[PDB]
Design a protein around this ligand. Structure first.
Ligand code: ADP
Ligand code: ADP
Lengths: 716, 66, 66, 67
C-alpha cells in the first residue's frame, strides 16, 4: 500500500482552500505548511489546497471542508489520491461567476464585498470548475471558477486579476456531471456487469498488459434478453465511468426508403465514432436491420447488412473502438454478424432473481426518505414477474399517488409554500399495495381441508427454493411433477395457486384445448413457447390443465388428428424431460380422467407424484365454509354445522354457489348475513357429480393401492 | 372470424380499457355452437373461439366491471 | 404549432423554442397538432421527419430538475 | 388490384370518385367473389384492406349523387 492515498474526514480548519495532514504523515511524505497540493478524487475531478499540520488528523485520512469535498465529488469516508504540484504558479487572470440562487435578493458590487477580501493576501490555489463559498452580509454566496489563464489551476496573488461578471452560468453544468449513471446504479447483473466492465476497462486503464501478453482484446458485445432489463443502462454506465463517448444508434430510426441513405448514415455514424476519440457504439434493436439475408425481399436491408459487415471487419476497419448491440431474439442475426471480431461475445442479461430485485428496489428508492416501517421483503417477494424497468415506474407511481392523496386538504402552493407539510413525507406500505394493484391473490388460507396434501405440496415446492446449498451438499436434484386427479369442482386450481403463492415464482396457467390448432406445427410451437417462457424466468411453476385432453394415451388413431396428438405428446415428452438442463420448472397437472394418459408422462422424473384429491367430508366442509367466509359480516345465530350436515356429498363449487346465492340474497335485502338467506338457498342445491364416477375413481384408487404390493417396513 | 382469437382478445381489451362498458354480443349461437364434437377445421376454429371467450370472460373480477 | 416548424432549421427551431422556454422562467410549452410533427415513424418514409422526431425526443429527454 | 402499396385501394378510391363525379351512374361490380372475399393465416392483409376500403367507400352514400 503506497501511503499516497487517503480517506476524507471532517474538517477542523473551516477555511475553503485548505486540507489538514498529520505530522507523522509529513515525515512519511515530505510536505509543508505553505505547500500547495493537488487533490484528485473520483469522477475524474481535481482541486488544489494548502496542507497544514493537524495533530487530530491521524495519518491515514485527511480533513477537508465540505467545499473541497464537494468539488472532488466525494463524501466523508471516501478515498482520494493526494500529490503535490509546485509547477502551478501565480495567476494572470480569473473568471468567477455567482450561482443564481445564492444571490437571489441582493445586487451591486460582489467583488468589493465578497471576492476582494476572500482572495486578498491569501494567494489561494484555485482550479477551473471549482465552486467556492464566501460568507458575508448575512448570507453565503457561491461562485464557480469558469476560467483561468495559467492552465487548469493557478494561484491568486495580489497582482492576479480577478474578473467577476453578473449574469453567469453555474450549477446546471455540474449536476449533469453528478446526475451521470454509475456502477452504484446497477443491480442484479453482477457477473455480466463485471465481465463487461473488465473487458472494456482493461484495454483502457493500461494497454501495457495486452502489449506484454501480445494479443488483441475482443471488440464486440452482443446483449440479448427481454425488453426492459437494463442493457443500455449498463452500456451507458460503462461509457460514463470510462473516458469514452456514448453514441446511440437506433434500429428503425436509421432505416429509410431512400436508396444509399441508411448506409450513408451508418458510415457517417462510424466516422463520427472513429474521428474524435476511442468511444463506445451502442446500436440498438439490431434484429430489425438483420433479416438473415434470405427471408427478406428488400434490397436495402441486405445493403445495410453488407454495410455493417464492411464497417465491422475489413481493411483498417476499427481503430480502438468497441461496438455494443441489443436484441430480444438473438437467433435472427447473421452468422457473419455473430462471428469473431464483430459480435464475438454473447451476454445473457436475463430477468434478475430476488436479491437482484431487492438491489434494484434499494437503488431506485435511494433519493427519497420513504418511511421507517416499510419492509422490502414483501416488495421483493410479491413482484415475482417484474423485469426491472417496471420497478422504477412502480416507485414513481407510488411516490405520485402518495402526494396525490396527501394534497386534497392542504393547498397546492397557490399563494405561499408551507414549512410543516414537507416534514414527515414519503410513501408507506399501502401506497406500494396500491401501486401493485395498479398474479393471483391467495395466501395458504382460501383452500379448505387436505392437510397432508398441503403439507406434501408445501414440502416438495418450498424445499428446492429455500435450501439450494443443502441440496448441493447432498448432491441430488429434487422432484418436479405433481399430478392431480378426481372429480371436478374439487380444488386443484386453488391448490396450485396456494402452493404457487408462497414462493417467489411466477404462474403460467394454460388450458388444454386452447393450444391445439388446425395448422401444421402450431400446437407444438405453442408448447415450446410456453416452456421457453417458463424456463426463461426461474423459478416458475407450470399448471397444465386437461391432461386427458392433451395426452389422450396416444397409441394408434390412424389419422391427421391422431398424428397431431402423437406430435403434441412427443413435444411434451421432449420439453418436460429431454435434452434440457431443468433449472427450475415445476410442472403441475390436473385432469379428471387418468386412464387416458399414456405411460410416458406418468414416468418418474416428469409427473411422478400421483396425488389423489378426494371429496371432502363434513369436518372438511366445515373448514371450507370457514375459509370461504373469511371477510364477511356474520350473525351469531347461524350454524355452519347444520349447513354442513345436510350436504351428503357436495363439492367446493356447490358450496361456492351456495355462498354466492347467499351473497346475492344479502345484496337484494340491502338494495350481516341472515339465516333465512341460507335457509332458502339450501333447498336449491345442484349436486352436479353423479354416483358412478365416484365408483370409478374409487376403483382407480383401489387399483393404485393394490399395485403397491409386497412393500412393508422393510428391515435390512 | 391466431387472428380469430386475437380479434376477441383485443375486443375485450378495448372493453376493459374503457371501463365501464357493455359488450352486446348479437346472435350468440353462431359464435358458441356448443363446441362438443365436430371433428374438422370448422370444429377446431369453434373450439378455439369458445375457449378464448371463456378464458377472457372468466377473468373479470369486481374491478373493470364489463 | 405542428407544421410551422419547417423551412437544417427545424432542429434549430426546436432548440430555439426549448432554450427560450428554459431560459426565461419555469413555464409551459404548448405544442398543438403533434400528428404533423410525429408521423408515427413506421408509415412515414421521409428523412427530415425522422430527424425532427429524433430532435424532439432528445430535446424532451434533456430536461433536468433546474 | 396492384402489387404496390396504396395503389390497390387508390384504384377503388378514384373509380368511386369517377362514379361520384358523373352522377348518376351504375357501377357493375362483376364477379364479387374476388373483391368481397370471405375473410376466414393470410398473405399479409391486403384483401381485408380491399374489403374495408370498399365498405368505407360504400357507406358514404347519402341521398345526394344517387349512384
Ligand atoms: N439493474 C438496474 N438497476 C437500476 N435501474 C434499472 C436496472 N435495470 C433497469 N433499470 C431502470 O429501467 C429503466 C429502463 O432501462 P434502460 O436500460 O434505460 O432501457 P431498457 O428498457 O432497454 O432496459 C431505466 O430508467 C432504469 O432506471
Ligand atoms: N377445499 C376448498 N376450499 C375452498 N374452496 C374450494 C375448495 N374446493 C373447491 N373450492 C371452490 O370451488 C371452485 C372450483 O374451481 P376450479 O378449481 O376451477 O375447478 P376444479 O376444482 O374442478 O379444479 C373454486 O373457485 C374454489 O373457490
Amino acid at each position: 500500500k503506497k501511503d499516497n492515498m487517503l480517506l476524507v474526514d471532517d474538517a477542523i480548519n473551516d477555511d475553503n482552500s485548505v486540507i489538514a495532514i498529520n505530522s507523522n504523515t509529513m515525515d512519511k511524505l515530505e510536505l509543508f505548511r505553505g505547500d500547495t497540493v493537488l487533490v484528485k478524487g473520483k469522477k475524474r475531478k481535481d482541486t488544489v489546497l494548502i496542507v497544514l499540520i493537524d495533530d487530530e488528523l491521524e495519518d491515514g485520512a485527511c480533513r477537508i471542508n465540505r467545499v473541497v469535498r464537494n468539488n472532488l465529488r466525494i463524501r466523508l469516508g471516501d478515498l482520494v489520491t493526494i500529490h503535490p504540484c509546485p509547477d502551478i504558479k501565480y495567476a494572470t487572470r480569473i473568471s468567477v461567476l455567482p450561482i443564481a440562487d445564492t444571490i437571489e435578493g441582493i445586487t451591486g458590487n460582489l467583488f468589493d464585498v465578497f471576492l476582494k477580501p476572500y482572495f486578498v493576501e491569501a494567494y489561494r490555489p484555485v482550479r477551473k470548475g471549482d465552486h467556492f463559498v464566501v460568507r458575508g452580509g448575512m448570507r453565503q454566496v457561491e461562485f464557480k471558477v469558469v476560467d483561468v489563464e495559467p492552465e487548469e489551476y493557478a494561484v491568486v496573488a495580489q497582482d492576479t486579476i480577478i474578473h467577476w461578471e453578473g449574469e453567469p452560468i453555474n450549477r446546471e453544468d455540474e449536476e449533469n456531471n453528478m446526475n451521470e449513471v454509475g456502477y452504484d446504479d446497477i443491480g442484479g447483473c453482477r457477473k455480466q456487469m463485471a465481465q463487461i466492465r473488465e473487458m472494456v476497462e482493461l484495454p483502457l486503464r493500461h494497454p501495457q498488459l495486452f502489449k506484454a501478453i501480445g494479443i488483441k482484446p475482443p471488440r464486440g458485445v452482443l446483449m440479448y434478453g427481454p425488453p426492459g432489463t437494463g442493457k443500455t443502462l449498463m452500456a451507458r454506465a460503462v461509457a460514463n465511468e470510462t473516458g469514452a463517448f456514448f453514441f446511440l444508434i437506433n434500429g428503425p430510426e436509421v432505416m429509410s426508403k431512400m436508396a444509399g441513405e441508411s448506409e450513408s448514415n451508418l458510415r457517417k455514424a462510424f466516422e463520427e465514432a472513429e474521428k474524435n476519440a476511442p468511444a463506445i457504439i451502442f446500436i440498438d434493436e439490431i434484429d430489425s436491420i438483420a433479416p438473415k439475408r434470405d427471408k427478406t425481399n428488400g434490397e436495402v436491408e441486405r445493403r445495410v447488412v453488407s454495410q455493417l459487415l464492411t464497417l465491422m471487419d475489413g481493411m483498417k476497419a476499427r481503430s480502438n473502438v468497441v461496438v455494443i448491440a441489443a436484441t430480444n431474439r438473438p437467433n435472427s442475426i447473421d452468422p457473419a454478424l455473430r462471428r469473431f471480431g464483430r459480435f464475438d461475445r454473447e451476454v445473457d442479461i436475463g430477468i434478475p432473481d430476488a436479491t437482484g430485485r431487492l438491489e434494484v428496489l434499494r437503488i431506485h428508492t435511494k433519493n427519497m426518505k420513504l418511511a421507517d416501517d416499510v419492509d422490502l421483503e414483501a416488495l421483493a417477494a410479491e413482484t415475482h414477474g417484474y423485469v426491472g424497468a417496471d420497478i422504477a415506474s412502480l416507485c414513481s407511481e407510488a411516490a405520485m399517488q402518495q402526494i396525490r392523496e396527501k394534497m386534497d386538504l392542504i393547498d397546492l402552493d397557490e399563494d405561499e409554500i408551507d414549512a410543516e407539510v414537507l416534514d414527515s413525507l414519503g410513501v408507506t406500505m399501502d401506497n406500494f399495495r396500491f401501486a401493485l394493484g395498479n398474479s393471483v391473490n391467495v395466501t395458504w388460507d382460501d383452500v379448505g381441508g387436505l392437510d397432508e396434501i398441503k403439507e406434501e405440496l408445501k414440502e416438495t415446492v418450498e424445499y428446492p427454493v429455500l435450501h439450494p446449498d443443502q441440496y448441493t451438499k447432498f448432491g441430488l436434484s429434487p422432484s418436479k411433477g405433481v399430478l392431480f386427479y378426481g372429480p371436478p369442482g374439487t380444488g386443484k386450481t386453488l391448490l396450485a395457486k396456494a402452493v404457487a403463492t408462497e414462493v417467489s415464482a411466477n404462474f403460467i396457467s394454460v388450458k388444454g384445448p386452447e393450444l391445439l390448432s388446425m395448422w401444421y406445427g402450431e400446437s407444438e410451437s405453442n408448447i415450446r413457447d410456453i416452456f421457453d417462457k417458463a424456463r426463461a424466468a426461474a423459478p416458475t411453476v407450470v399448471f397444465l390443465d386437461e391432461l386427458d385432453s392433451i395426452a389422450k394415451a396416444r397409441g394408434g388413431s390412424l389419422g391427421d388428428a391422431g398424428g397431431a396428438s402423437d406430435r403434441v405428446v412427443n413435444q411434451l415428452l421432449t420439453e418436460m424431460d429431454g435434452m434440457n438442463a431443468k433449472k427450475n420448472v415445476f410442472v403441475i397437472g390436473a385432469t379428471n380422467r387418468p386412464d387416458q394418459i399414456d405411460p410416458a408422462i406418468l414416468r418418474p422424473g416428469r409427473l411422478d407424484q400421483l396425488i389423489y384429491v378426494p371429496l371432502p367430508d363434513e369436518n372438511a366442509r366445515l373448514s371450507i365454509l370457514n375459509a370461504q367466509l373469511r371477510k364477511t359480516p356474520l350473525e351469531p345465530g347461524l350454524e355452519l354445522t347444520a349447513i354442513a350436515k345436510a350436504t351428503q356429498g357436495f363439492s367446493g363449487a356447490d358450496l361456492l354457489y351456495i355462498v354466492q346465492r347467499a351473497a346475492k340474497y344479502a345484496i337484494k335485502d340491502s338494495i350481516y348475513i341472515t339465516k333465512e338467506h341460507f335457509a332458502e338457498a339450501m333447498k336449491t342445491a345442484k349436486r352436479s357429480v353423479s354416483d358412478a364416477e365416484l365408483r370409478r375413481y374409487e376403483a382407480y384408487s383401489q387399483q393404485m393401492k393394490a399395485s403397491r404390493g409386497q412393500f412393508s417396513n422393510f428391515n435390512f
